[PDB]
Amino acid sequence: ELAPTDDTYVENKSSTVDSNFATSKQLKFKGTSKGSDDRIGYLKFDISNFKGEIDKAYIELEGKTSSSSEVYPPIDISIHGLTDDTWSETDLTWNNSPNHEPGSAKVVGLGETATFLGKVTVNFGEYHKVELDITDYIKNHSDNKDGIVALMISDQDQNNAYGWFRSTQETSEDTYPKLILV
Ligand SMILES: [Ca+2]
């Protein structure tokens, strides 16, 4: 059970394109038609101390979607593995963050520096767990041989649905993102 070394989000607003969010309890996401007000989350883990051969690996998050004006249907949020692990949580801003187009969350590098791992279904109004089996990526992909795992969290499908996952800045450790190594 590993907590991130790094977790943050970035946000596409003129007031916050140069802002860092590593102090927040939230890993925000949003994907809009135009890309304004998009948010992307990022995680890093260090698996280099895992004694033994990894058999299964899972990413677990805790999150929800949120609106005062409508009930969202379940929203599928994409998880990518990134080659780029060169950043720390305090480095990333919208303007300085990897694997997306400059005006929206649209992914850059698919199949090359960004590996699609799957989507997690996020539900409305109440925190819940999601989990994605990422065994093949952790066990086999070139990105993870250096022991530093980098993940991106985004809406790639323009749902125009705000939400967040809970970060390492929450008071309860049980809400943190978790990389589970068997
Ligand atoms: Ca790596």
Numbering used by the authors: -2 to 179
Text of the article:
Carbohydrate-binding modules (CBMs) are the noncatalytic modules that assist functions of the catalytic modules in carbohydrate-active enzymes, and they are usually discrete structural domains in larger multimodular enzymes. Recently, we reported that the marine thermophilic bacterium Defluviitalea phaphyphila codes for Dp0100, a 201 kDa multimodular and broad-specificity endotype alginate lyase that carries a PL39 family catalytic domain. In the present work, we identified a new CBM domain in Dp0100, which exhibits a strong affinity to alginate, and this added another functional domain to this multidomain alginate lyase. Phylogenetic analysis supports that TM6-N4 constitutes the founding member of a new CBM family denoted as CBM96.
